[PDB]
Amino acid sequence: DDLVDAEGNLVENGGTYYLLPHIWAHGGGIETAKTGNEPCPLTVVRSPNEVSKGEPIRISSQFLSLFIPRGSLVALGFANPPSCAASPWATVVDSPQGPAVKLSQQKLPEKDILVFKFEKVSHSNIHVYKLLYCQRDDEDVKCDQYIGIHRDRNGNRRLVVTEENPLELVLLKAK
């Protein structure tokens, strides 16, 4: 069983998608914001605008195949990343508030990038996924945490590792 997009078509490996909430009242798509003493927008957030599709995100499987098997590790890359980032890849990095999804000004190894999995949320006609964060040690993988939303002091809806508001997403093909 492969990953399926919001329109019912298989997700294409390396293709670009908007990551939208299943419940549109939860906000819009995925984007970036500058927080703390960041020099540029490195914090990955969900748009507070329910009409916004956010940024196109490239979803790249650990496997060199046309589609994405459901248990595949994936990397999430901004199609149009902020110019200050060293690469387009969003990863989990420690923040002063705890592990959070961010872009980086450092080039990261594959073991820090291929760290996500989409987990199908049991039924609904439209394919809805939670976003797992996976530990890696050599060949071993443990996906025991989720990505969810933490609203900061300034009202940014940050993507963080947490059990608070676990994301449930639909994947809409960008064009």
Distance CA 89, CA 16 (A): 13
Write down all domains in the chain, each with its CATH number in brackets.
1-175 (2.80.10.50)
Q: What would the two tokens of residue 100 be?
A: 């959070």
**Half-sphere CA count of 114, side-chain side, radius 13 A:** 18
Amino acid found at 19: L
What was the experiment behind these coordinates? X-ray
Taken in order 156, 160, 166, 167, the sign of the CA dihedral is positive
